[PDB]
Design a protein around this ligand. Structure first.
Ligand SMILES: CCCCC/C=C\C/C=C\CCCCCCCC(=O)O[C@H](COC(=O)CCCCCCCCCCCCCCC)COP(=O)([O-])OCC[N+](C)(C)C
Ligand SMILES: CCCCC/C=C\C/C=C\CCCCCCCC(=O)O[C@H](COC(=O)CCCCCCCCCCCCCCC)COP(=O)([O-])OCC[N+](C)(C)C
Ligand SMILES: CC(C)CCC[C@@H](C)[C@H]1CC[C@H]2[C@@H]3CC=C4C[C@@H](O)CC[C@]4(C)[C@H]3CC[C@]12C
Ligand SMILES: CC(C)CCC[C@@H](C)[C@H]1CC[C@H]2[C@@H]3CC=C4C[C@@H](O)CC[C@]4(C)[C@H]3CC[C@]12C
Lengths: 377, 377
């Protein structure tokens, strides 16, 4: 059981966060792209909350997520701790947004509030002192370093899972790159969003690149072509989508008679990527639609979770949100729809986070039931 | 141990209450005497919070408050439950005050909000359904009924303790009387606050009358003059103070050439009442300044609380706040200081509540250590 003080802190943070959200909504209804700046922080807070929910559900369902992630049996971060961290970060995020909205102090400008929020987040993650979740934070930092140096390090379940999360959090990297461009040029006024370039596509594909190189490393280590090269192609579909969209946009800016062929290539490879990722998540990562399953239709014969309706709704939402996520990657990597691109990305990113949350649920359950990832011996 | 959900609710209520207080302060810095209307609710919430703290401290110190109050051992109200109730009531109070400040709904008039808040509080206290700590609420209702009908019922420790709480919460009754007068006449400008009447003075003396009649009944039952008649005189001192203050102000309104005589008599009786109450609290209720104590100076021989500095600070604060409370009674019951009387009473009432909180601490401690109250055989 979590400490009573931990529960009190979680409740206090949740209440303050709720009232801060209400105040922000009231201020909204009653110089900087604040939406893009704060999208990353909001997505991180939502991901932390959904991670706490994932931990609670795994504990309730009996899934041995601790063993899969190779976490210390003696000390395990509770879902309440994740909720507390998410609530505190959300409170700080809301306070920064309110300060931007109202500008309480004339001497203090607006950019310093988001700058301090993100800087405090980074410092808290890498806080040298052993004060607030130091063990878990150091483990997460090691995992992040391993994931980024994917080819050099052997791929474990934790590395692959974190790389998948990054794939679901590419919006943060996109927003950071856009902010860098805005500072470099804007601060034509809208040159950054008016024109798309290759480095933007590279930043979009970075998570997929990490996953693809991890798959190549796993193929080299295990020498099994089917389990790993197919996943590598699944991740390469994303690169093909991104570069084809970028070419289509570039030739839209200046027609070379190849705009239409690039449009067709982008559409076909977008459909291919959506189908590939959806099928991999539905069959390989989840294990559903198993032949052995006779009691549960379209599911696997053993289902740890209580309701099959959970699995069915997960399938439907996974399909819809996979198509939505590929659409969002296309919109964010390249201009495409300029006027509504930012709005589409903002609406879609939380949906992608929720989809990855459900996917984490079901993938961890399947891995507990069967060694789908083959990480274990 | 309190339920985890109870702790989460306590934290959520505390956070919402804190943010609502911040919003109220910011609105204040940026027809109805709202101060008088809401002082009673604020004092009630503060008393509930301090009572929860008292219960926690009694549990920590080993004081058998359950046995002293003759409460059911199996079923008890944890300090966390009191904190939750206080937080919810404070949230409702803050929402009502904010609604009054902003008048969010044009159709709804201002007077509805405080009326709705107080009606909801009363209904919650007298809720017939078996919900929201129904057993404790019924016990409290029975205790209040017995306390008000003091002479007819034999005095127990709980009755005397609740009567003392009422003595420390006479400001609520004073505010209710002032509101009744305001509705009767105002709804001459400021007629009620400009002048004082005998009914106001009588209302000021209601808790003291209850305590005095309880002491008389205890004297009749026990037949011991010293333990009860001395306390009866202690409670008569406040009657004399209030009566002489009212008489002096009445003579000030209509000169009789004896106003100075009444002023001197009121001052003398105020000093008498302050000294009587302070001496009774320090020597009898707390049992300090005992000759038996060899290792403790100015304190009783046996102390359960970890620090004697607590006892010394309690002595000092009681000394100051008894005079402060007598001044508050004199100012509120009468028109002694019409210009600043309301502010003085508003500042002093929380101080009186805090004094009663410390007094509850030490009185329960002394009763557990020694049967000073003589309520046990
Ligand atoms: C694109 C931008 C960045 C995207 C987001 C990046 C990273 C976050 C993603 C995942 C975090 C890990 C979630 C848990 C997964 C394993 C299951 C589990 O629940 O295991 C947890 C692992 O706890 C964790 O790892 C910590 C959870 C996350 C805490 C968040 C820290 C603050 C971050 C601030 C923002 C940072 C970025 C700056 C702002 C831009 C069990 O904890 P333990 O203490 O037993 O850990 C093991 C420790 N031993 C082995 C020594 C005992
Ligand atoms: C102007 C007048 C304002 C209203 C009156 C003032 C104060 C009311 C609050 C508290 C006084 C009683 C404190 C007793 C302490 C004993 C030690 C202990 O803490 O032990 C607790 C006492 O619990 C209580 O009785 C409840 C304490 C109060 C809880 C809050 C209820 C709502 C109050 C709302 C007031 C609304 C007023 C509106 C304006 C008029 C043990 O709990 P149990 O569950 O064993 O209770 C006994 C139940 N058996 C016997 C069946 C086991
Ligand atoms: C609104 C629709 C489209 C979204 C898809 C349905 C959502 C609500 C479903 C998909 C998977 C479901 C989760 C699957 C497993 C668990 C673990 C269990 O111990 C508690 C419920 C919980 C946490 C479920 C909550 C509901 C859930 C998140
Ligand atoms: C006004 C100045 C000079 C003195 C103020 C002293 C106050 C703050 C002192 C007087 C009695 C003290 C309390 C006495 C007993 C306890 C119980 C213990 O388990 C926790 C601390 C607690 C609750 C103390 C907190 C501090 C306290 C309330």
């Amino acid at each position: 059981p979590a400490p009573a003080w931990t529960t009190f802190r979680v409740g206090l943070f949740c209440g303050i966060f709720i009232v801060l959200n209400i105040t922000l909504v009231l201020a909204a209804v009653f110089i900087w792209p604040l939406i893009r700046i704060y999208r990353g922080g909001f997505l991180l807070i939502e991901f932390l909350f959904l991670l706490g929910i994932n931990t609670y559900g795994w504990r309730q369902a009996g899934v041995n997520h601790v063993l899969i992630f190779e976490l210390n049996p003696r000390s395990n971060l509770s879902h309440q701790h994740l909720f507390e961290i998410a609530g505190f970060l959300g409170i700080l995020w809301c306070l920064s947004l309110l300060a931007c909205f109202f500008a309480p102090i004339s001497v203090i400008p607006t950019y310093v509030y988001p700058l301090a929020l993100y800087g405090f987040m980074v410092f808290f993650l890498i806080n040298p002192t052993k004060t607030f979740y130091y063990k878990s934070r150091f483990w997460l930092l090691k995992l992040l370093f391993r994931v980024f140096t994917a080819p050099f390090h052997k791929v474990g379940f934790a590395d692959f899972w974190l790389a998948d999360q990054l794939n679901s959090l590419s919006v943060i990297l996109m927003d950071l790159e856009y902010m860098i461009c805005f500072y470099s040029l804007e601060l034509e006024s809208g040159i950054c969003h008016k024109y798309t370039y290759g480095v933007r596509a590279i930043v979009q594909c970075i998570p997929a690149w990490l996953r693809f190189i991890q798959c190549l490393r796993r193929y080299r280590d295990t020498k099994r072509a089917f389990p790993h090269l197919v996943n590598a192609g699944k991740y390469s579909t994303t690169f093909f989508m991104v570069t084809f969209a970028a070419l289509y946009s570039t030739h839209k800016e200046r027609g070379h008679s190849d705009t239409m062929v690039f449009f067709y290539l982008w559409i076909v490879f977008y459909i291919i990527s959506s189908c590939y990722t959806l099928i991999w998540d539905l069959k390989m990562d989840w294990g559903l639609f198993d032949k052995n399953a006779g009691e549960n239709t379209f599911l696997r014969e053993e289902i740890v979770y209580p309701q099959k309706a959970y699995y069915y709704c997960a399938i439907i939402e996974d399909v819809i949100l996979r198509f939505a996520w590929t659409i969002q990657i296309s919109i964010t990597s390249t201009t495409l729809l300029p006027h509504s691109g930012d709005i589409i990305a903002t609406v879609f990113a939380p949906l992608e986070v929720f989809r990855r949350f459900v996917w984490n649920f079901f993938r961890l359950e399947n891995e507990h039931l069967n060694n789908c990832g083959e990480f274990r011996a």
